[PDB]
């Protein structure tokens, strides 16, 4: 921008490019996100987004400023050291130690529990927007409601469907906090196996990968599923696979927690608050990760 000196280009979110920037003024380093706007600017968005600035929690990346100047939209966020995606890729040979995987999940659930208790949903959780620092903390960033859902980035980028909840893929028009628990369950499994749980390359491939693993849902396990917008009676009928084949070598408390995070029925899916009381977290600690910056 003007009051900023773009150091580098962190990458690209679902709304626009993200830059690492130094505030010439204060000199403090931030993550600056340019939002893509050809047609009128949203009135509700800026107001709703501005409300997000009042969302403080150790596991939520602080939104420092919403700048609407020169009829452009910038979001200024506190800058974190690395994202979980790069960290997992960096830990692919050894894998993230269980104590650290457990600490990250525990913290992310606290972050979600806080956002959800405030009626704020993320809707697009993914390793790329989970950020960690040298002190072992992990925070949720790059939150969807305020500015609808873009079919593509401002410049043709392949949105990842790997973490999308089944009700969304089945065309549910209303989201619930349950969609965030599902995405986190998928990320949790991924840290454990060092491989994406459901790496779909299309909406239907995404849906069928979930079905082939958890079994094609029906009215018994998911009341109302057959009446969902994109449900087709012609969906193949896959049987549920043994869960011990899904996330080995995760212990039973972990598998029990994960299965509850991956329940088909949003209403049966465990909440973030309830998950925090799960016995899996009985021996939770806060290890410090080895970060290569
Ligand atoms: C990747 C580490 C650089 N530091 C960052 N610090 C942040 N606060 C970042 C983000 O909020 C973000 C969100 C979505 C996509 C890309 N970046 S990125």
Beta bridge partners of 88: none
Look at residues 99, 18, 67 and name the one whose alpha carbon lies nearest to residue 284.
99
Looking at 124, 201, 265, 283, which residue is catalytic?
124
Q: Is 63 in the pocket of ligand 1 (CB under 6 A)?
A: no
Between the CA of 131 and the centroid of ligand 1 the distance, in Å, is 7
From which experimental method does this structure derive? X-ray
Greatest alpha-carbon pair distance for the chain in Å reads 60
Q: Tell me how many degrees the CA angle 147-148-153 measures, rounded to the nearest 5.
A: 85
Contact 72, 34 (CB under 8 A): yes
76 is in an annotated binding site: no
The encoded tokens of residue 48 equal 């709703």
Round to whole Å and give the CA distance between 249 and 192: 8
Contact 127, 202 (CB under 8 A): no
User: What are the sequence ranges of the domains in the chain?
Assistant: 1-81, 82-290
CA distances from 121 to 144, 145, 146, 178, 187 (A): 8, 8, 11, 9, 17
CATH number of 1-81: 3.30.200.20
CA distances from 3 to 23, 36, 69 (A): 6, 20, 12
Round to whole Å and give the CA distance between 216 and 275: 25
The encoded tokens of residue 229 equal 């917008």
CA distances from 80 to 184, 283, 291, 293 (A): 20, 27, 12, 11
Tell me the CB-side half-sphere exposure of residue 10, using CA atoms within 13 A.
26
Residues 127-158 as b or e (16 or more Cβ within 10 Å = b):
bbbbbbbeebbbbbbbbbbbbeeeeebbeeee
16 is in an annotated binding site: yes
Which residue's CA is minimally distant from atom 4 of ligand 1? 80
Look at residues 8, 52, 53 and name the one whose alpha carbon lies nearest to residue 29.
8
174 Cα distance to chain centroid: 18
- For domain 82-290, give the fold: Transferase(Phosphotransferase); domain 1 (1.10.510)
Between the CA of 80 and the centroid of ligand 1 the distance, in Å, is 7
Which residues are CB-contacts of 288 (< 8 A; sequence separation ≥ 6)? 134, 135, 136
Which residue's CA is minimally distant from atom 8 of ligand 1? 79
The residue to mutate among 21, 78, 82, 83, having the most atoms of ligand 1 within 8 angstroms of its beta carbon, is 83
The encoded tokens of residue 78 equal 């506190």
Round to whole Å and give the CA distance between 170 and 64: 35
Look at residues 203, 197, 239, 199 and name the one whose alpha carbon lies nearest to residue 218.
239
Contact 225, 264 (CB under 8 A): yes
Whose tokens are 């619930």? That residue is 176
Round to whole Å and give the CA distance between 265 and 188: 19
DSSP secondary structure string, the chain? --S-EEEEEEEE-SSSEEEEEE-TTT--EEEEEEEP------HHHHHHHHHHTT---TTB--EEEEEEETTEEEEEEE--SEEHHHHHHHTTTT---HHHHHHHHHHHHHHHHHHHHTT---S---GGGEEE-TTS-EEE-----TT---SS-TT------TT--HHHHTT-SS--THHHHHHHHHHHHHHHHTS-SS--SSHHHHHHHHHHHH----TTTSTTGGGSTT--TTS--PPPPPGGGTSTT--HHHHHHHHHHT-SSTTTSPPHHHHTTSGGGGG----------
Between the CA of 133 and the centroid of ligand 1 the distance, in Å, is 11
């Amino acid at each position: 921008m003007e009051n900023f000196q773009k150091v580098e280009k962190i990458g690209e979110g679902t709304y626009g490019v993200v830059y690492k920037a130094r505030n010439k003024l204060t000199g403090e380093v931030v993550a600056l996100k340019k939002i893509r706007l050809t047609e009128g600017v949203p009135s509700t968005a800026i107001r709703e987004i501005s409300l997000l600035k009042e969302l403080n929690h150790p596991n939520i990346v602080k939104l420092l400023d919403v700048i609407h100047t020169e009829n452009k939209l910038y979001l200024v966020f506190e800058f974190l050291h690395q994202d979980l995606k790069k960290f997992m890729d960096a830990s692919a040979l050894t894998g993230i130690p269980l104590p650290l995987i457990k600490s990250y999940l525990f913290q992310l659930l606290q972050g979600l529990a806080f956002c959800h208790s405030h009626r704020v949903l993320h809707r697009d959780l993914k390793p790329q927007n989970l950020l960690i620092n040298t002190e072992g903390a992990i925070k949720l960033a790059d939150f969807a409601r305020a500015f609808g859902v873009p079919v593509r980035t401002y410049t043709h980028e392949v949105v990842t469907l790997w973490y999308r909840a089944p009700e969304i893929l089945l065309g549910c028009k209303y989201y619930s906090t349950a969609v965030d628990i599902w995405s986190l369950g998928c990320i949790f499994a991924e840290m454990v196996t060092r491989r994406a749980l459901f790496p779909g390359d299309s909406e239907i491939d995404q849906l069928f990968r979930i079905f082939r693993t958890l079994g094609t849902p029906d009215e018994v396990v998911w009341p109302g599923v057959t009446s969902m917008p994109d449900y087709k009676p012609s969906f193949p009928k896959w049987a549920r696979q043994d869960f011990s084949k899904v996330v080995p070598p995760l212990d039973e408390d972990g598998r029990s927690l994960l299965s509850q995070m991956l329940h088909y029925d949003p209403n049966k899916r465990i909440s973030a608050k309830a998950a925090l009381a799960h016995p899996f977290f009985q021996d939770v600690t806060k290890p410090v990760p080895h970060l290569r910056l």
